[PDB]
Amino acid sequence: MSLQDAEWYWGDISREEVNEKLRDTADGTFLVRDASTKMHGDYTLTLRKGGNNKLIKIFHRDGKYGFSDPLTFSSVVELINHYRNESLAQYNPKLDVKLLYPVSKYQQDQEDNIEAVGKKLHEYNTQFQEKSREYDRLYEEYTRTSQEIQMKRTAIEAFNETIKIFEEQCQTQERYSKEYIEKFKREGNEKEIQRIMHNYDKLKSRISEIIDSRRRLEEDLKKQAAEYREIDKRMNSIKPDLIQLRKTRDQYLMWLTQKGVRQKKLNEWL
Amino acid sequence: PSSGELWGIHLMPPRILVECLLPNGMIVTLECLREATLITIKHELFKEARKYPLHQLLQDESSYIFVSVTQEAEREEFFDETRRLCDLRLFQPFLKVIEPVGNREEKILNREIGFAIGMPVCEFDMVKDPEVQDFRRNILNVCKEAVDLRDLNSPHSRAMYVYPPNVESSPELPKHIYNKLDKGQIIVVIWVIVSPNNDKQKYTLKINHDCVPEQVIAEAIRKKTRSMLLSSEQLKLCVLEYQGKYILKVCGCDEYFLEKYPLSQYKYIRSCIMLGRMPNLMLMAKESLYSQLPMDCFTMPSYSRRISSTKSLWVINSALRIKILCATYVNVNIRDIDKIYVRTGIYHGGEPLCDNVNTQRVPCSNPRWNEWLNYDIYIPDLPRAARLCLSICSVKGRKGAKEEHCPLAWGNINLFDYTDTLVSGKMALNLWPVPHGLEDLLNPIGVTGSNPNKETPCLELEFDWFSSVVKFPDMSVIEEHANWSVSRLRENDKEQLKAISTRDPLSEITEQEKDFLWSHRHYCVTIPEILPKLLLSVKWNSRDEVAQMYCLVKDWPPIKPEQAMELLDCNYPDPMVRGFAVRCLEKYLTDDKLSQYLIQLVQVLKYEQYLDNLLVRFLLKKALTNQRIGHFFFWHLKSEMHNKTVSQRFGLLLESYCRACGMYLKHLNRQVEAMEKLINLTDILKQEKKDETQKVQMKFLVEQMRRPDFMDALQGFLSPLNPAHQLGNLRLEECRIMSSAKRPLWLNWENPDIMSELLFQNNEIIFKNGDDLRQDMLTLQIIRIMENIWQNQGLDLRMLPYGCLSIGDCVGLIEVVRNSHTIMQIQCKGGLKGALQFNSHTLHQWLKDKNKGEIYDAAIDLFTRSCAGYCVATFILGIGDRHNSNIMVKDDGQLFHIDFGHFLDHKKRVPFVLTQDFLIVISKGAQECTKTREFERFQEMCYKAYLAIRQHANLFINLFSMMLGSGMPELQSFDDIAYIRKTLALDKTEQEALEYFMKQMNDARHGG
C-alpha cells in the first residue's frame, strides 16, 4: 500500500512525456508525477477529460494530502483510490469522471540476459534507423515528384491556352478567307487560292505539332502522377511499422533501466 | 517562376523564328533577335505581312498589340511594347496580334505586380471564393489611408516614407554608452561636395549628444561663420537658411536624418558611440533628395468598385453533429493497411471543445462512411473561433504488439465563415499531406482551407441545414447575456494572482489555478499582465463564460507589445482577443520593434481565421507608411509564396502592397529579376554541370556573368539584406563559386556612394540556393534580441547577428563579415605542438599579431565579451556543440557563430564551446587560466548574461511560439519549445537556475 511502488506513479517525468502517454486516450485515464518544480513531497496528477490532459496539483501538509484547502487523506494512494471508487465530482462538478484507467510504469514489456540489450536492442535500433532512412528517402523523392508534377500541370495548361489561340486562328482563317476563296474561285485565280491554303495548311500543320507536344507531356504526367501516388502509399505503409519498432527499441531500454545505469548504451556509443 | 526565356530553354539564340498570328487567319514566321523589342517586332511583322495573303484586312500597326502565353500559363496582353522578346517569359515563341482591350495603364501595372509577387494577378480574378473578392476590395481602403497619409505634406511626408528615421526605440541611452561621450558631448564630422570635380571638404564638430539634426546643422554653419563678423540676427538668418535648405545623410549608404529625433537616438550614431567610431555625415541639399522621389500615383483597380431572413446561433436548442460522407484519391496499400477511418475534433485554437469522435473503421478499397458524428457540445455553446479539425487515419493490427494508427492526410474547417455565419449544406475539401515528423492523428495548427492541388485526397462532409441561415450573435446580446449570467478585496489571493503573472507563457497552470483566476477575473484588471493566463482558463465551450469574458477584454488595460504578441499566437484565435492584441501594437509597438519582430508578426498571419482581420490591416497599414518594414514585409511574404497553404493569403496580401507601395515596386522588381538570374545560374550549376569540374564551373560562371543582359540586371540595384546599401558594379575579379556542395555564390559589388570610402568601398554577400536559411534568420534575429537586452542592462556583450534573409524555398542571402576567419582556419595559421595536436595558444598568438600595441587589451576585452555572449546564447538555444569551422573571429577580436542551419541538420555533447584556446585568450596567455582574475570576471559576465535573458524569458518563448505554423521542423509543437524552459530553468528559482548554469559551465570547460 505504498506510493513509490504503485502502478500509476512515474514521478520524475516531463509534462511532454505524460502528454505523449495520454495522447487520444479516453476520459478518466490518469498518471501522477512529482511537480515540475522538482520539489519534494509536492506532486501533480494528470487525467484525461474532454479531449484535454488536465493537471491537478496535490497538496501536502502536516503529513496529510489532498488537492484543495480542506486536506484530509493520510497518503496519496488513499487520495487516489478514493476517487477510483467514486467520482471526483465530489471535488468539482465541472469534471465528473473517476480516476478510471491508470497508466502503469511497468505492466509494459517486450530470459533477460544482458543480450536482450547488447544484442536485441542494438538489433531493434539498427532495424529502426534503416526504416527511418528509407522513409526520409521516400519523403525526399515524394516532395521531388510532387513538384515535377505541378510543373507539368501548369505547362499543359499553358498548352491549353496556346491551342485555344491557334484554334481561334483557324476559325478566323476560315471566317475571313471563305469569301476571298469564293471570289478567287470565279476569277480563276488558283494561284491565290493556294497561297491561302499553303498558309492554312501551314497553320494547322504547326497546331498539330503543339497538340502532339501537349499529349507527350500529359503522358509523362500521367505516369509520374501514378508513381507519385505509389510513393505516398509506400510512406503510409512505412509509417506504422516505423513507429512500432521505434517503441520496441525504446522500451528495450527498460532492462538497461533495470540495470539502472546507461553504461551499456554508452558502450554502444563507444 | 521562370527557369528561362522560353519553356525548357535558359537563353534564346541571338536569332530565332517567331510565329505571328494576324487578325486574319494568316501565320507569318518572323526571324527576329533574342532582344528585339516588341515595337521592333510589330513593325517588321506588318512590313513582312505584305508578302502574305489578305493583307488588305489589317488596320494600322499602331492599332494592334501582341498577346501570348507565358511560362506561367497566363494569356498575357503585352501592352508594354518596350519589352525585349526574351524578357516576356514566353512559353512557346509565338505572338497573337489583337486589338488592345481594357485600360492600358492598369494591364501594364498588373504585369509588373505579377513579376513582383511571383504569380499572375489574373489568377485572383478567377477565384470563386467571395472571401477573396471581398478581401481584395475591402483592404483597398487601408491603401488609400496610407497613400493619402504619406502624400499629405509632400515632399517631406513622401521622403519620410521612403527614408524613415532609423532610430532606437528610446533616447535613454544606458550609462555604459554615455561613458564614451566627452563630458556628455559627441564629436562628429560633416562632409560637403565641391562640384567642379566633386572635390570634398569636412567640418569636425563637438556637440551635445542630444542635438537634433537641425541643431547639428546649426553648430556647423556656426563654426564656418566664425570669422564673418555677423550680428546675432544675420546669423539667425543663414542658420534658418540652412536648417530648412539642407539635411544630413550617412556617408556610404542611404540613411537620412529627416526627423528631429535626438542625434544619438539614430541607430548609426548610437553605435558610433558604442563602438567609439567617428560618425561621418554628409550635408546634402533637400531639393536633391526630393528630386529622387518621383511622384507616384495610386489608382483604384477594376475589381474595386462593382458587383453584378436569418437567426442567431443562440436560438438553436440542439447539439452539434457533422456528417462525413466519403473520401477520394486515398493512397494506401490495401494489404499492409487493414482499415481506414476519419478522426475529427472540434477545436478552439488547440483545446478540444469536446472529446474527439471518429467514423467507424472502413476498408481501404471503399473509403465511404455516410456517418453523422455527434459531438458533446451545444450549438449555442460554440465560440466564434471554433474549428473542425479532421484527418484520415490508417490502422495496422497485431496481438504480440499494439495496434498502430497513422494519419494519411488532414484538413481544418472554420465552423463560422468570415461573415460569421455558421456553415451548412454538404461540403467537400481536398486534404493536405501530413507534415514530416508529425504523428498526431490531427493537425489543429494547420491552416484552414482546401488543398488546391489536384488528385489529392478529397473528403466530403455535410453540416446541418438549420431552417434558415444562422449567424453568430451581435455583440449587443452577448454583453446582456453576461449581465444575465453574472447575476447567477483579498490579500493572499491577489498575492498569488500576481504570483501567477510572473510565470512564463508555457508554465503548468493546474485546474485549481485556472478556475481560481476565473473567480477573481474582475480583480485581474489590476494586474493586466495576467490576461493571457485568464483566457486559457475560460471554458470556451460555455457561451455563459465566453460572453462574460468578452466584457472584461472590452475594458482591458493595454498591455505592452512584448506581451500583446502572445495573444496573436495559435492559442488565442478569438477575434475579440486578437483585436485587443492588435490595438496594443498599433499604439505601443514602435516601427523599430515592428521591424524587429516582423518575422513573427508576418508568421502569425497564418493563424488568422480569415483573410480580412485586424492584424493584417495593421501590418499592411504600417508596411505602406514605412518603406523599411514594407521592404521585409514584402520579402518575408514573397519568401513563402511556394507554400500553397498560404500562397493565396500571402498573394492577395502582396498584390495589395505592390499596388500601393508606389515607385518602390520598380526597385523591388529589379531585386527580383536580379535574384531570378542568380537562381537560374545556380540551378544550372547544380542540375546541368554538377558533374563538371570546379574550374569548368568557374568559367561558365565568369563567362555567363560576362554577358551584357546579365550584368545590366545584376548591377545597379538595392541589396535585399538592407535596401540602404546600393549595389553598383560587380567585381567579377572577386566573385566565385564556393566549396560547399550546393556551391553558393560569393558576390562582390562596388559601393557607388559618392563617399563610399567612408563606410565600405565594396560590399560582398553570399547567395546560397539549396539551403533552408530561415533557421539562420530566426537564430540571427534572436541573437539580435539578446544583444539588445544585454546592452540596455549595461552588458556590453558584442554579438554579430549578420544579415540573413530567405527569399524563397531554400534560397537567400547572407552578409559576409569582412576581415574574419574561422577558428579552424586560425589553428591552420599556427603549428602542431602536441603529438598531431594543434597548438592551443595559436589563437592567442594570431590575435596578438593582429593587435600589436596598446590595442591588445581592447581585443582581449572584445573576445572575452563576445565569447561570453555566444557561450550563453548557444547553450540557451541548444546551439552549444559547434565545430571549430562554425565559430568565427574577426581580426577585430569579435567572436561569432555561423551556419546554424548546418548544425540543426547535422543533429539527425557539451553545454557550450568553451575550449582551452579561448581560455588562453581570455586570461591573456596564462597558466592555469581557469584560476586567474580575467577568467574570474569572464564567468561573471556569463552569469550576469544568463539571468538577464531569463529575466526576459517571456519574450523569447512568445517569439518562438509565434513561429509554430511556419513549417520549420524545429518548431512543430509546443513540446519543441520545452527545451528553452530547461536551459533557462524556469521551473526553478533564480539561484537554482544560476547553480544549474554554473554546473554546465564547469562541465563546459571539460572539467574544473
Ligand SMILES: CNC(=O)c1cc(NC(=O)c2cc(F)cc(C(F)(F)F)c2)c2c(c1)C(=O)N[C@H]2c1ccccc1C
Ligand atoms: C543539443 N541540442 C538540443 O538537444 C536541442 C536544441 C534545440 N534548438 C533548436 O532547435 C533551435 C535553436 C535555435 F536557436 C533556432 C532554431 C530554429 F528555429 F531556427 F530552427 C532551432 C532544441 C531542442 C533540443 C528542442 O527540444 N527544441 C529546440 C529549441 C530550443 C530552444 C529554443 C527553440 C527551440 C526550437
